Each structure stands twice: as C-alpha cells, then as structure tokens.
Design a protein around this ligand. Structure first.
Ligand code: HEC
Ligand code: HEC
Ligand code: HEC
Ligand code: HEC
Ligand code: HEC
Ligand code: HEC
Ligand code: HEC
Ligand code: HEC
Ligand code: HEC
Ligand code: HEC
Ligand code: HEC
Ligand code: HEC
Ligand code: HEC
Ligand code: HEC
Ligand SMILES: O=N[O-]
Ligand SMILES: O=N[O-]
Ligand SMILES: O=N[O-]
Ligand SMILES: O=N[O-]
Ligand SMILES: [Ca+2]
Ligand SMILES: [Ca+2]
Ligand SMILES: [Ca+2]
Ligand SMILES: [Ca+2]
Lengths: 520, 75, 520, 74
C-alpha cells in the first residue's frame, strides 16, 4: 500500500513543481503516486540530482483515479482494419508503389488503427527495423491492453545480442530513428533533451542507436502528453510543436493572430545543472487542435538532402526533427526555407518531398475550424448518460461510431443517414481526384525511361523533374491525410486539380521531346 | 480547487483515525476530500471539539476518483 | 420398396467385400441399398463379371439413413459470391491477366463457391469446354440440390451431335481433360483404372474424349469419397493422392514420420480378370487433413512440357496425373524431379509452373497442424445442440459462419470480434504482399518487350526467364491458395518476399542491359 | 457464492482495467458474468428457463397459500 511522502520537503528544492502542483487540481495528489524518491532526497543538493528518483510513465499510474478515461483510451476498435496496406487497389493509394519508388514507405505503409497499438505497430512495420521486432505470436495482434502494459510484454527481438539496424527479412527497410519515437511514446521525456540535441544530461538524442533506444521504451501515447501531471492542466510535450509555435513565433493558429492569442501556449523549461534541458508548452485552454497536433502533422523525422546542392542532411542536423507547420499551399516554401527534400524518385530521379498525415494543417481555415470546432468535438466527445457523471471519451476514432454526440448535436436538421451521406459525398469526390492524380503521375513517371532512352536532353528531364516535385506534393498530401478530404474539401479539390495540371504539363513536355528525338 | 490539510496535525488528536488511514489504501487521500475542518482545528483541543468540522456524505465525494463505480451505481 | 438380397451369396465370390462389410458399422446395411445385381449373380463366375451389376453413385443413396449429413452437405452458402472473377482489382489477383498470359486460366478463373456446384461449375467455366455447356437458363445457378441430383438435370450441351473439344464462343478455352473430373466427382470410380492408365476393363482413361466422358458423369463430391461404403470407415479414393502417399512412400505427413505412422493409409487394390485395376486408401484415423487433400492440393492434371528439352508431355504420360505433395519451398525441386513445366509466358517466353489451391501442403508445419488441428476442426465442426444427438456438419465453409464451434471453443480468451480481427490481420498483411509481388512481376514482364526490341542478348533474356520462374512460383502459390495466408502466415510472408526479390533482380538485369544497348 | 456474484459482478472487457459493477440488478441483464461463467454447460436460454421453473412453481404455491388464507379469513 502506498505511503505518502512529505511534499514540502520536495518543494524546498523544486519551486517550479511547487508553483504548478499547489495551485492546480492535483494539489491533493501525493508524489508517491508517480515517483519513488527516497534515495534521491537523501543525496540530492539544491543543484545536483544525486541518486536519480524513479518516475512512473505507465498509463496505469493515472488509471487508479481515472478508470473511465483509461478504459475508454485502451478500447480497440476492431472495425479499424489492422495491418491494411495502403498500396492496394482497395485502399487509399492504388498506385503508391510506382509513385513512391525510392522511399522506405514502399516496403510497407498500413492504414492507422487504434492508439493502443502505436508503439508496437511502429516497432513491427516492415519499413522500420528490418523485421527485427515481431509480436510474440500472431495472436497478440489483438491485445490492446497488453501493448499498453508494455511493448516488450507482447514483442520479441530476433537478436537481443546486437544493436545495429539491419535487414532480418529481404523486403524490409531500416527507416526508424530516434525522432520517430517522439510521436509514439514519451517514456523518454526525462532522458531526451529539447529537439533531441546532444546534451550531457540526455541518455538519448537524435544520433542514438535506435535499436538500443527502442528497447528502453514501453508505453504508447502516455496520458501526460496532453495533461500536466503536476497541475493537471492542458499542455503539449512534443518538442517539434513547441519549436514551431513558440521558438519560431508562428503561433497555435498561424493564419489567425487573434485565436493564437486567445488559445496560446507558454513554454516552460526545466534545467539540469542550471543549463536548459527539456520543455513543455502549457495551453491557455484545453484545446485538442493543438494537443492532437503533437503527432497528426506533416514533419521531418529522418535524414534527407538539400535542395540547393543535393548534399546529405543527417540525424545530427536540427532539420531531422522539424514541424513545417504549413498548409499544402505554403509547404513548398516551408521546405525551401530549410533547404530540404526527402528522397530522389527511383524512376524519374526527381528530388521529392515525403508528406505525412497533415490533419492539423489541413483543418486550418476549414468551415469547422473557423467556427471554433476542434478535433475532440468529432473524435473524442463527451459521453451522454441518462443518469451519471459526464466524462470525456478517450477512444479517438471515427465519428461514425458516435454520430449523436459527434455530429447530430450540432446538425439538428439531419438524421444519422443524412450526415453519413454528406461525409461520403466529400470522401467519394476526393478519392476520385486522388485516383485521377495518380493516373497522371504514373503516366508521367512511365515516360521518363522512354525519354532517357530516346536521348532527351538533361535540360528537358530536369524541367520535368521540377514539375514532378509539385505534381507529387499536391497529390501525396491527400493520400497521407486521413480524412479523404473531409477536413477541408475545397482545399483538397484545389490541390488535387493542381497535381493533375502539373503532371499533364510534364507529360506534354516529355511526349514532345521524345517525338522530336524520334523525328531526328 | 482543493488544498490539502496537514493530516499529521489531525492525528495528534485522532489516533483512532490515524491507525486506520495510515495503513489502508486511502493513506494518500487527504482529509480535505471529505472534511472541512479549518475552524475546528483553530478552536479544538484533544479534550474539547471546539467548532464542529463538516463531513461530506454526498456520493460525489467518492465519484471524483471512482467515476466507474459511481456511474455504474447511479444507472 | 427395397427387398434385401442374400449377401452370403455375394460373399462367396467377394471375399474382400466380406472382410470389410461384416466387421464395420455397415454390417447390417444390405447390398440392395446401392447395388442391383440380380442378372450379375445369374451370370458371373468366380473370375468373370458376367452381366455388370448396377451401382448407385448418387448421394441420395446415403441420405435415406443419414439425412442430417446430406442436408448439411448440400446447403448453398449464398454469401460465397458466385462466378466472381479473380483477375479484377477487387478480388484475389488484380494483375492476373498480365502475369498468367499464355495459360488457359486467363480465359476465366472464378473464386470457389459451395461444394454442391463443383461439377456443374467445372462444366460451365469459360476455360474448360469452349463454352459448350451452359446452365439451362441463368436461374439454375442457384439450384444446389438440383446440381447434386445431377449435372445434366441443370445443364445443356450446345451440340449433342459432336464430341470434339472446340470453341463455341470466341473467348473460351478447351483446357478440360479427363484427369480434372477426379476432383469433381467419383461417378466413374468403377470405370477408371488407377491413375487413368489404359486398361482393358476401363471405359475411361487419361486419353479419353473428355466431352464424351463429361456426358456420363452427374454427381459432385460423392459421399463415398471419404467413407468406405462397405466398412463405413474413413478412406480416400483419389489415385494421385494414394500414389504420392503410398507408391512414392512419402507418407501422409511428409515432414513428420511419426505422425505419418500414427495417421497412415493402407492401399487396397481391386482386380479385374485377376489384374490390378483400381485402388482406395483406408485411413488409420478419420483424418480430414488427408481426406480434403484428395482435391485441395497443387497437382498436374494437364499436358505440359519438359524443362530439359522443351518437348511436349501429353495426357498419355503419367505426369499428366500427378500430386507433387511438396510445400512451396520444395516445389521447384518436385517439378525438376519429374522434368515438367506448365506453359510458356506469352510476353516473356519464360517456362513457368501453374500452381493450384495448395491448402494441404501449405497447412503442413503451421502452428495449428503441429498442434494436431485438422481442416474439419475449422471448416466442418461438430454441431452444438442444447438437446440432441450430435453429428458432424458437412457444410464445408469459412469458420466465420460458426466461430463458436470452429475457433472460440479452443480460444477461450477471445470474443468473436477479436478472433475475426486476428484472421483479418494476417489476410490484410498477406494480400498487401501479394499485391506488391504482382507490381514487381508486372514491372519485369513489361521490360521484356523493351529489352527484346532494344537488341538485348538471348543470354540476358534467358537469365531473366530463369528468374521469372522463381518470381512466378513464390507469388502464384498465394493467389492459388484460398486462405490469403491464414493457413501458414510465416511461410506466405517468406515466399512473397522471395518473389519480390527475384523480380527486383530481373528488373535490374533488364534495365542495365537495355541501358547498355542504348549507350552503344 | 455471495449476492455480488449474481447481482454486481466484475465487468468483462476485451481490453481494459477490470472493476466491479455497482449496478445491483437482476442477473438476467448480465447472464454471461452472473451465471454462465459458472454454468458452462448452459446457454443463456437454458439458464433463464431454470430460473423460471423455480419462480413459476413458487408463485403457484404463493397463490394457493393466499387462496387458503383468504378462505379462512372469510
Ligand atoms: C534539493 C536537496 C532536492 C530535494 C529535497 C528533492 N529534489 Fe528532486 N531533484 C533535485 C535536483 C537538483 C534535480 C535535477 C534537476 C534540477 O532541477 O536541477 C532533481 C530531479 C528530480 C526529478 C527528475 C529526475 C530525472 O529523471 O530527471 C524528479 C522526478 C524529482 N527530482 C522528484 C523529487 C521528489 C518527488 C522529491 C520529494 C520526495 C524531491 N525530488 C526532492 C533536487 C531535490
Ligand atoms: C488519485 C490519487 C489521482 C491520480 C493518481 C491522478 N489524478 Fe488526475 N485528478 C484527481 C482529482 C481528485 C482531480 C480533481 C477532480 C475534480 O474535478 O475536482 C483530478 C483532475 C484531473 C484532470 C482535470 C484537470 C482540470 O480539469 O483542470 C486531468 C486532466 C487529470 N486529473 C489527469 C491525470 C493524469 C493524466 C494522471 C496520470 C499522470 C492523473 N490525473 C493521476 C486525482 C488523481
Ligand atoms: C502521437 C503521440 C499522437 C497523438 C498526441 C495523437 N495521435 Fe492519433 N494516432 C497516432 C498514431 C501513431 C496512430 C496510428 C496507431 C497505429 O497503431 O496504427 C494514430 C491513430 C488515430 C486514429 C485512427 C484510429 C482508428 O480507429 O483507426 C484517429 C481517429 C486518431 N489517431 C485521432 C487523434 C485525435 C483526435 C488526437 C487528439 C485528441 C490524436 N489522435 C492524438 C499518434 C497520435
Ligand atoms: C509525429 C510528428 C510523428 C512522427 C515523427 C512519426 N510518426 Fe508514425 N504516425 C504518426 C501518426 C499521427 C500516425 C497515424 C496516422 C497515419 O496516417 O498513419 C502514425 C502512424 C504510424 C504507423 C502505422 C501506420 C503505417 O504507416 O503503417 C507506423 C508503422 C508508424 N507511424 C511508424 C513511424 C516510423 C518508423 C517513424 C520514424 C521514421 C514515424 N512513424 C514517425 C505520427 C508520427
Ligand atoms: C491528448 C491527445 C490527450 C491524451 C493523451 C489524454 N487525454 Fe485526457 N483529455 C483530453 C481532452 C481534449 C479532454 C477534454 C478537455 C475539455 O475540457 O474538453 C480530456 C479530459 C480528461 C479528464 C477530465 C474529465 C473528463 O472530461 O473526462 C481526465 C481525468 C483525463 N482527461 C484523464 C486522462 C487519462 C487518465 C489519460 C491517459 C489514459 C488521458 N486523459 C489521455 C486529452 C487527452
Ligand atoms: C468534425 C467536424 C471533425 C473535426 C473537427 C475533425 N475531424 Fe477528423 N474526421 C472527420 C470525419 C467525418 C472523418 C472521416 C471518418 C469516416 O469514418 O469516414 C475524419 C477522419 C479522421 C481520421 C481517420 C479516421 C478513420 O477513418 O479511422 C483521423 C486520423 C482524423 N480525422 C484526425 C483529426 C484530427 C487530428 C483533427 C483535429 C486537427 C480532426 N480530425 C478534426 C471529422 C472531424
Ligand atoms: C461369383 C460367381 C460372384 C457372385 C455370386 C457375385 N459376384 Fe459380383 N463380381 C464378380 C466378378 C468376377 C467381378 C469382376 C471383379 C472381380 O472381383 O474379379 C464382380 C464385380 C462386381 C461389382 C463391380 C462391378 C463394376 O461395375 O465394376 C459389384 C458392385 C459386384 N460385383 C456386386 C455383387 C453383389 C452385390 C453380389 C450379390 C448380390 C455379387 N456381386 C455376386 C463375381 C461374383
Ligand atoms: C441405412 C440402411 C444406411 C444406408 C443406406 C447408409 N448407412 Fe451409413 N450407417 C448406418 C448405420 C445403422 C450406422 C451405424 C450407426 C452407429 O453409430 O452405430 C452407419 C454408420 C456410418 C458412418 C459412421 C462410421 C464409423 O463411425 O465408423 C459413416 C461415415 C456412414 N455410415 C456413411 C454412409 C455413406 C457415405 C452412405 C452412402 C454410400 C451410407 N452410410 C449409407 C446406416 C446406413
Ligand atoms: C474434390 C472432390 C474435393 C474434396 C474432397 C474437397 N473439396 Fe473443397 N472444394 C472443391 C471444389 C471443386 C470447390 C469449388 C466448388 C465450386 O463450384 O466452385 C471446393 C470449395 C471449398 C470451399 C469454398 C466453399 C465456399 O463457400 O466458397 C471450402 C471452405 C472447401 N472447399 C473446403 C474443403 C474441406 C475443409 C474439405 C475436406 C473436408 C474439402 N473441401 C474437400 C473440391 C473438393
Ligand atoms: C484436384 C487435385 C483437382 C483437379 C485435378 C482439378 N481441380 Fe478444379 N478445383 C479443385 C479445388 C480444390 C477447387 C476449389 C478451390 C479453388 O481454388 O478454386 C477447384 C475449383 C474449380 C473451379 C471453380 C473455380 C474456378 O477456377 O473458376 C473450376 C471451374 C474448376 N475447378 C475446373 C477444373 C478444370 C477445368 C480442371 C482440369 C483442367 C480442374 N478443375 C482440375 C480441385 C481440382
Ligand atoms: C470428406 C471430404 C467427406 C465427404 C465427401 C463426406 N464426409 Fe461424412 N464425415 C467426414 C468427416 C471428417 C467426419 C467426422 C469424422 C470424425 O470422427 O471426426 C464425417 C462423419 C460422417 C458420419 C458420422 C456421424 C457424424 O459424425 O456426423 C456420417 C453418417 C457421415 N459422415 C455421412 C456422410 C454422408 C451421407 C456424406 C455425403 C453427403 C458424407 N458424409 C460426405 C468427411 C466426409
Ligand atoms: C482453423 C485453425 C483452420 C484449419 C485447421 C484450416 N483452415 Fe482453411 N481457413 C481458415 C480461415 C480462418 C480461413 C479464411 C476464411 C475467411 O472467412 O477469411 C480459411 C480459408 C479456407 C478456404 C477458403 C474459404 C473461404 O474464404 O470461403 C479453403 C478452401 C480452406 N480454408 C481449406 C482448408 C483445407 C482443405 C484445410 C486442411 C488442409 C484447412 N482449410 C485448414 C481456417 C482453417
Ligand atoms: C445467484 C446464484 C444469486 C445469488 C448468490 C443471489 N441472488 Fe438474488 N436473485 C437471483 C435470481 C435469479 C433472481 C430472480 C431475478 C429475475 O430476474 O428473475 C434474484 C432476485 C433478487 C431480487 C429481486 C431482483 C429483481 O427481480 O429485480 C433481490 C432484491 C435480490 N435477488 C437480492 C439478493 C441479495 C441481497 C443476495 C445475497 C443475500 C442475493 N440476492 C443472492 C440470483 C442470486
Ligand atoms: C455495499 C452494498 C456497497 C456499496 C454501497 C458500495 N460498494 Fe463499492 N464494492 C462493493 C463490493 C462487494 C465490491 C467488490 C469487493 C470484491 O473484491 O469482490 C466493491 C468494490 C469497490 C472498489 C474496488 C475496485 C472495484 O472492484 O471496482 C471501489 C473503488 C468501490 N467499490 C467504490 C464504491 C463507490 C465510489 C461507491 C459509492 C458510489 C460504492 N463503492 C458503493 C460493495 C459496495
Ligand atoms: O541506424 N542506427 O541507429
Ligand atoms: O509514420 N508515421 O508518420
Ligand atoms: O480434347 N479432346 O478430348
Ligand atoms: O481448377 N481446379 O483446380
Ligand atoms: Ca484506421
Ligand atoms: Ca515529411
Ligand atoms: Ca468462396
Ligand atoms: Ca499445377
């Protein structure tokens, strides 16, 4: 049974914690719930840690007093198809292999499933660790509670005796690096300096051996990613987001200075040996748009290349941990701003960006966002009870599962079937344009080998490669983004029409150049 | 927002509660969750109650940390 | 009304039948239930048949005393989509036409449906008899009971006056031959010598006119394919299976000598004029793995070619009726062992195997097979009744229709939705790898015309054709096998990754050779 | 067996932290957790049928007891 410790004794040294804890809704919650600090208190000084106290990062540390939120969080949505490859005719991107050739995602890119699995799914996907990690058997794939209890209770490592990234099966890749983990877990929150910079007090950084890092991590999406454990107040912990909003001064809503002021973020920094070490961003309001934008954004979390000279940008560079914090029409400029691209296309040779799930930046400027609606309104609404204490659902999932609480409460004029029909109209129209964009991208890509072999000039191939950048960006944003246009249908339509225009321009350029070579 | 009271000071006069509270699974649950004893502490001795402290009997006193049991109960 | 005959009179000549009938559970079942032998008894001698007795092969011969099993067998699963072409984006093999070009399956290859239809479906598929046979009208496609009563009660022949295989519609083929029928019916069990060899006492053989043979056959999957009618004991009748297990000494479980001994097969041969004529294999146990492997195996049942010299192997050769009885990683060696391949690819010219539904050989070595689970446990389980005499369901179908009896009885830790989710995880992952394998196969295939036309050498094209054999085998096994990886997910993953590796090797070879020609 | 085993059993979850239901009510609303976990030989309809046999027989004797008490009282 837990015995409380004297918090006033901690507060003698920990004035920042005192200021947060004594004022918020956890003022009665004793430190012993999350920390074992006996030897720490015996040996610390006002500026030196002494023995390191133990800090619980497991979600069950909160489940004792918040069982409803925990139980809602760990639910598995079985209707969210697991391990479903996007590069197939029946999923999001039928021509993905041709279009993404040259990038690690060609090895496997499945649709998302329930949050309980994020860390185990990261560890087992074919593109991440060379096939090194697997579920202990194929039955464990169902075990959401198990994954939450800890990744290593449900996974095996093919070679515990080595820590190098290598292929264990032929069609895998080793794309994982330490930055990825920041959007899967925050178990390393005390062992990682802000941005993953080298730091005397950090065990792990952008340049760590990712296999060794992986082995130290256990829990997905920790409750304290959105909730400060000391004040219980709303916050973010993700360094890339704090860097965009605060360090770069872009604000929580870059398109809306007023909303950014009303719904802002305060950076709080914690030190080690009186040097800055880690940071959090306390939110003015419980704003899920900004909480979910810790992960559901377009980012860099990988090495790449410079647009200016083609040279390598490695994990050691700050650019390997970066939130662009730009919508699709500002992205090219944001990538030029840091002089960066992701890969060269295997067939066309074009420098190309790789886009990832940009839900937050897509939502900006939409009719719902402009009306003050936020991700949680549609994806984790208040529970409705005939008799009971209301709490917030923490099962983040499609609003189709709770249409009464997620849509129909605001849209009193619709039945459930009408609301679903409105969503499907947008998704159907958007998907048709994604398919047409891929058709035109593929037609262009297929012309590159023909043009090269016919003796078309580098100058023409380079012009086509510049078009390929834009054709790719204005398409891939939408296969990466998970709403199939719902979050911003006018933007998806304008962007996909731009992709098609760019491909058609490139096809015409290449066909004319090939025909001229043949005519000579 | 609740502010914790000094439970040790209570225990200087409440040995019977001390022996139950310090030992069970509510050892970390501060008395402020269920009692308002400010004026009591100002006026009491070990042999004189002074001002009567307030004790909460409402089931919501438990529902803050035990919402699932409370919600199942009130169905 | 049936009148019993004196069996002791038959037994005077038929000592093998006596030894089986008097000892088993049909010892009280009179011969008149299945045989009309009056004139036979008047005219036979101890070694000459005399007048041939009539033998009932219809399934209603058993339905009189076993109505529950019969009625369960003939059920039509309407959720098993009928006439559903596999070569489409929404079915098993989106790029099948490109990959199988040169083979008869390109004309039509539908998904399987309920067993009642096997013989009629064989007769009407576009690749089999040139479109000669059709259902009497499009309504008869629903009539499972009708098909069971007899194929010719529900089909028409476009030209009863000729018996040649020819095209009646332009996009059909005439791939059917007498060996096919052995996995559709055993109505010919007394008219077909072991292996379909020429034999004085056999009306039909591998070299018969298949249209004439077809016309003599009526019933699908006769009850006596798995059950000896005389002893009622478990058996197989399929010659190709007996030949693999017994004649070639490979055993019922080639990877497990112990299980092969415990769950073995005894070949029993019946003679005509004191020469061997036909055979059955009595099973030591009622082992559905071996019963279902009468048909759900990879086989040859067709002419083809020799790998050594390219020469024709016709229906007259024993190789035209052959069970390889090898898993996917032993198949190439098994095909080399008989010096055989199926077709030359129409675009690449490569010698290629054609794979067919290898469920039995895929199941070997799987976690379920190694734990003593058999096909019937998942596909035809015991019926569960609140009050009643238990019997075995004979409706062979997906376990999704009876999850309580097929999975959840052994997997007490799962709900139905969890079990379904585990199946879908495997099928989704496997299908993604099948699609990627086809993508890489198609990329290779498309390079052959480019390479030929650029003047690439025969030596390089031949190296690529050798790679095409392996790329094809390691892919096609999985579009042929019906579980989409469920029966052996680790094997499917390893094989499909091998297919992709082989295609990538071939693509690289061809691209480099084309580029070198262009550079000259 | 105790009252809670039939009237406020542990909740069964595919994924989650187990807690005790505090909705004290007839086991007919949660037969999987209140009866069928101990009576593996029964379906839900069989277990309900066993309950009803007892209640039907008992209620018949209650009604007959009242008939005779009423005849005496009159
Ligand atoms: C002064 C003598 C201290 C007392 C009393 C306590 N702590 Fe402490 N702690 C102290 C220092 C100098 C540091 C390093 C960081 C800094 O502010 O300079 C810490 C660190 C912690 C941490 C972080 C540990 C990690 O893994 O990084 C925790 C969780 C922590 N301390 C908790 C804590 C608690 C619960 C105490 C009361 C029981 C406590 N500390 C006393 C200095 C001092
Ligand atoms: C019991 C000992 C607790 C543990 C362990 C945790 N929390 Fe808590 N929390 C607790 C109480 C008594 C309250 C106040 C209830 C009230 O409404 O007055 C809270 C409140 C929260 C809130 C709401 C904060 C707000 O609205 O300003 C959040 C978001 C919260 N708690 C989160 C949380 C997390 C993430 C924990 C694990 C790190 C956690 N709590 C532990 C009691 C207890
Ligand atoms: C990084 C730590 C994340 C934060 C914060 C949020 N999400 Fe998320 N989400 C994340 C990952 C890595 C995944 C995929 C997990 C996997 O194993 O595949 C997801 C998934 C979703 C989904 C899909 C759920 C399903 O049924 O398929 C939704 C609807 C979703 N995420 C929404 C969401 C919302 C609304 C958030 C703020 C409250 C949020 N996520 C935060 C990573 C992270
Ligand atoms: C936050 C900025 C993220 C970083 C850095 C990484 N990932 Fe991620 N991931 C993120 C979200 C919000 C989601 C769900 C939405 C979606 O479109 O998938 C995911 C999902 C995954 C998955 C499951 C789906 C899949 O692609 O197969 C895997 C396997 C995954 N992520 C792996 C991964 C790796 C290897 C990363 C570093 C290269 C990486 N992620 C970074 C959010 C973020
Ligand atoms: C960000 C992606 C979140 C994570 C991770 C967790 N929670 Fe949360 N929580 C979130 C939001 C947007 C809200 C609603 C705030 C609003 O005012 O609209 C909540 C709320 C809470 C509360 C308060 C009571 C309630 O409304 O339910 C508690 C006690 C709470 N959350 C606890 C909690 C726990 C235990 C978590 C880990 C399982 C958890 N939260 C994760 C956003 C996020
Ligand atoms: C209601 C007005 C919404 C707001 C605000 C947000 N999203 Fe959404 N999202 C919405 C719909 C109608 C859909 C399609 C769901 C369907 O079943 O067709 C989505 C989709 C997602 C997804 C994928 C979910 C899935 O299909 O499993 C994700 C990951 C998602 N949305 C995330 C998300 C985030 C992070 C948001 C705030 C920035 C957000 N959504 C806002 C409806 C609404
Ligand atoms: C000896 C005079 C016989 C008596 C009495 C019966 N049968 Fe016979 N039968 C006999 C011979 C020599 C043969 C040829 C096969 C052989 O063992 O050498 C047969 C064949 C049959 C068959 C197979 C017919 C076919 O189509 O191939 C059947 C089904 C059969 N016999 C049945 C049978 C029954 C039911 C009898 C009693 C009524 C019976 N036979 C008597 C020799 C003799
Ligand atoms: C009635 C006159 C029967 C006809 C016609 C058929 N069978 Fe039969 N069968 C019959 C009885 C009385 C029994 C024994 C019942 C018992 O359990 O004691 C059987 C048994 C079988 C069995 C079980 C055999 C075993 O478990 O060893 C099978 C597989 C069986 N019967 C199959 C069968 C088939 C395929 C028939 C048509 C060729 C058939 N039977 C006819 C009664 C009668
Ligand atoms: C050859 C005589 C067969 C034996 C013995 C078994 N099966 Fe079969 N099966 C066979 C064919 C020719 C077909 C396709 C029929 C058609 O008209 O398309 C099938 C089909 C199945 C299916 C699919 C059923 C559906 O609903 O789609 C299953 C699940 C199946 N077969 C399983 C099965 C099992 C478990 C067997 C041993 C008990 C078995 N089959 C024997 C040919 C033959
Ligand atoms: C046993 C070794 C078989 C031989 C010889 C033949 N077939 Fe077959 N067939 C077999 C099974 C187990 C199944 C169901 C499983 C599957 O993957 O389909 C089938 C199915 C058919 C079907 C229906 C499905 C289809 O491909 O359209 C047809 C039309 C069919 N089979 C025809 C056929 C022909 C023409 C054959 C000789 C060339 C042939 N089969 C042989 C088992 C066996
Ligand atoms: C192989 C593909 C089979 C065909 C064709 C038929 N049956 Fe069958 N039968 C089969 C199995 C695997 C079993 C179970 C054996 C075990 O012990 O697990 C059965 C069982 C019977 C029985 C016994 C009673 C029972 O368990 O139901 C009977 C009477 C029986 N089968 C009859 C029967 C009839 C009439 C068939 C044609 C419609 C029939 N079987 C086909 C395998 C196979
Ligand atoms: C349970 C452990 C199984 C055993 C043993 C066998 N099979 Fe199976 N099969 C299984 C599953 C879960 C599936 C996928 C079904 C789904 O609905 O997703 C299958 C599939 C088949 C099929 C195709 C069925 C269909 O989808 O209509 C066939 C033809 C089939 N399996 C045959 C088969 C044979 C012959 C087996 C013994 C060698 C066998 N299966 C074992 C589950 C199980
Ligand atoms: C399972 C073995 C039981 C135990 C232990 C207890 N009770 Fe029960 N109770 C049980 C049944 C099957 C029924 C009939 C319910 C029906 O729907 O037919 C009851 C009934 C009650 C009732 C009336 C409930 C109602 O019909 O709404 C009460 C108030 C009740 N039981 C209380 C109770 C108490 C206090 C127990 C412990 C002393 C107790 N029950 C034990 C099944 C079981
Ligand atoms: C007697 C009639 C009870 C009343 C009034 C309350 N609860 Fe209860 N509780 C009861 C039992 C029989 C049990 C299970 C004991 C066992 O171990 O089998 C419980 C359990 C709890 C727990 C522990 C966690 C759990 O098992 O769910 C908690 C936190 C709890 N109960 C809280 C609770 C609250 C908040 C109540 C008022 C709404 C409440 N209980 C009333 C019996 C009784
Ligand atoms: O790839 N090395 O972490
Ligand atoms: O793969 N995660 O963006
Ligand atoms: O094709 N002649 O049977
Ligand atoms: O087409 N039958 O394998
Ligand atoms: Ca999903
Ligand atoms: Ca990116
Ligand atoms: Ca089918
Ligand atoms: Ca074959």
């Amino acid at each position: 049974n837990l015995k409380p410790v004297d918090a006033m004794q901690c507060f003698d040294c920990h004035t920042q914690i005192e200021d947060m804890h004594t004022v918020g809704k956890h003022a009665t919650v004793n430190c012993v719930h999350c920390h074992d600090a006996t030897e720490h208190v015996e040996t610390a000084s006002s500026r030196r840690m002494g023995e390191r106290p133990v800090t619980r990062m497991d979600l069950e540390a909160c489940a004792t007093c918040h069982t409803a939120q925990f139980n809602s969080f760990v639910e598995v949505r079985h209707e969210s198809h697991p391990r479903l490859e996007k590069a197939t005719p029946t999923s999001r991107s039928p021509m993905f292999d041709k279009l993404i050739a040259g990038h690690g995602f060609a090895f496997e890119h499945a649709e998302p499933r329930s949050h309980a699995f994020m860390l185990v799914d990261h560890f087992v996907v074919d593109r991440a660790y060379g096939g090194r990690f697997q579920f202990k058997n194929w039955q464990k794939v169902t075990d959401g509670m198990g994954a939450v209890r800890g990744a290593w209770t449900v996974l095996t490592d093919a070679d515990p005796e080595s820590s190098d990234q290598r292929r264990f099966l032929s069609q895998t890749a080793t794309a994982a690096n330490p930055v990825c983990l920041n959007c899967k877990t925050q178990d390393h929150i005390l062992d990682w300096a802000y941005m993953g910079d080298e730091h005397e007090a950090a065990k792990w950084s952008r340049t760590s051996e990712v296999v060794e890092f992986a082995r130290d991590l256990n829990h997905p999406l920790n409750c304290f990613m959105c909730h400060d454990p000391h004040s219980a107040g709303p916050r973010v912990v993700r360094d890339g987001l704090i860097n965009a909003v605060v360090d770069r001064g872009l604000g929580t809503y870059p398109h809306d200075p007023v909303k950014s002021e009303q719904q802002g973020m305060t950076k709080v920094t914690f030190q080690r040996g009186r040097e800055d070490f880690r940071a959090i961003g306390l939110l003015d309001t419980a704003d899920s748009n900004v909480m979910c934008a810790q992960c559901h954004v377009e980012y860099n979390c990988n090495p790449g290349y410079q647009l200016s000279d083609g040279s390598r940008v490695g994990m050691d560079d700050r650019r390997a941990n970066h939130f662009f914090w730009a919508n699709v029409f500002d992205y090219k400029e944001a990538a030029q701003e840091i002089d960066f691209f992701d890969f060269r296309h295997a067939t066309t040779g074009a420098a190309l960006p790789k886009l990832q799930h940009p839900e937050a930046e897509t939502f900006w400027g939409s009719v719902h966002e402009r009306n003050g609606v936020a991700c949680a309104d549609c994806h984790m609404p208040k529970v409705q009870l005939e008799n009971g204490k209301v709490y917030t659902s923490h099962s983040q999932r499609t609003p189709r599962d709770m249409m009464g609480q997620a849509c129909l409460n605001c849209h009193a004029e619709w039945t459930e079937d009408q609301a679903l029909y409105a969503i499907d109209y947008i998704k159907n129209y958007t998907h048709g344009k994604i398919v047409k964009s891929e058709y035109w991208l593929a037609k262009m890509i297929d012309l590159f080998p023909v043009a090269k072999r016919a003796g078309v000039s580098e100058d023409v191939l380079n012009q086509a490669r510049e078009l390929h950048y834009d054709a790719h960006l204005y398409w891939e944003w939408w296969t990466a983004e998970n709403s199939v246009g719902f979050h911003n249908p006018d933007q998806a339509r304008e962007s996909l029409m731009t992709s098609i225009s760019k491909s058609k321009e490139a096809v015409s350029l290449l066909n004319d150049a090939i025909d001229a070579q043949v005519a000579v």
